[PDB]
């Protein structure tokens, strides 16, 4: 399924022998929707098991400015850099932008610092309203079709600013 059957560098076509070998493989994609957690197991080469996630609803998400990861439930996937039918059909891929329940992070901030390691950082203002609404923006960072879970990190700073402009001189 890989490496042949296509034009050369010059543009000529190559006569084919050596029919498809198993190690070329190429399994079908895992269009991971969000929903009740369900993951199948695929036996890759050498009996190495891979976890093909079909639906997830939660995952470990990190506060990178504070560098602390908390498990939380994802709400809705709102952007992905690739084809934008994936956001419409609500699939989870490696670096799509999703919405995350902010309550675990706010509660952790309260129990650690108080007031509504590398402490006393002064955070940023633009994330405060996003927290106060209750839902925050995050970027996936794992590969759900490979590791079987959808982990990610809260986006802030100019990256958040970039995605905010890209989502909503705007429509």
């Amino acid at each position: 399924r890989d490496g042949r059957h296509k034009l050369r560098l010059t543009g000529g076509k190559k006569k084919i022998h050596k029919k498809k070998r198993k190690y070329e493989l190429g399994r079908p994609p895992s269009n991971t929707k969000l929903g009740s957690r369900q993951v199948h197991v695929v036996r890759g080469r050498g009996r190495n098991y891979k976890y093909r996630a079909i639906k997830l609803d939660s995952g470990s998400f990190s506060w990178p400015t504070f560098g602390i990861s908390k498990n939380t439930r994802i709400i809705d996937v709102v952007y992905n850099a690739s084809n934008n039918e994936l956001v419409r059909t609500k699939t989870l891929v490696k670096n799509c932008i999703v919405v995350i329940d902010s309550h675990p992070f706010t509660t952790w901030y309260e129990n650690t610092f108080g007031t509504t390691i590398g402490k006393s950082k002064n955070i940023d203002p633009l994330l405060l309203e996003q927290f106060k609404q209750g839902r925050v923006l995050a970027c996936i960072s794992s590969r759900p079709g490979q590791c079987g879970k959808a982990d990610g990190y809260i986006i802030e700073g100019d990256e958040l600013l970039f995605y905010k402009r890209k989502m909503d001189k705007r429509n």
Binding site: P64, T65, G67, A81, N95, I155, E159, F162, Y163, K166
Partner: peptide, 18 residues
């Protein structure tokens, strides 16, 4: 510098503690 429909990050740069 950001001209793609994705955020170019330079993975491995470190942005918060360093």
């Amino acid at each position: 510098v950001q001209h793609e429909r994705a955020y170019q990050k330079q993975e491995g740069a470190s942005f918060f503690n360093s």
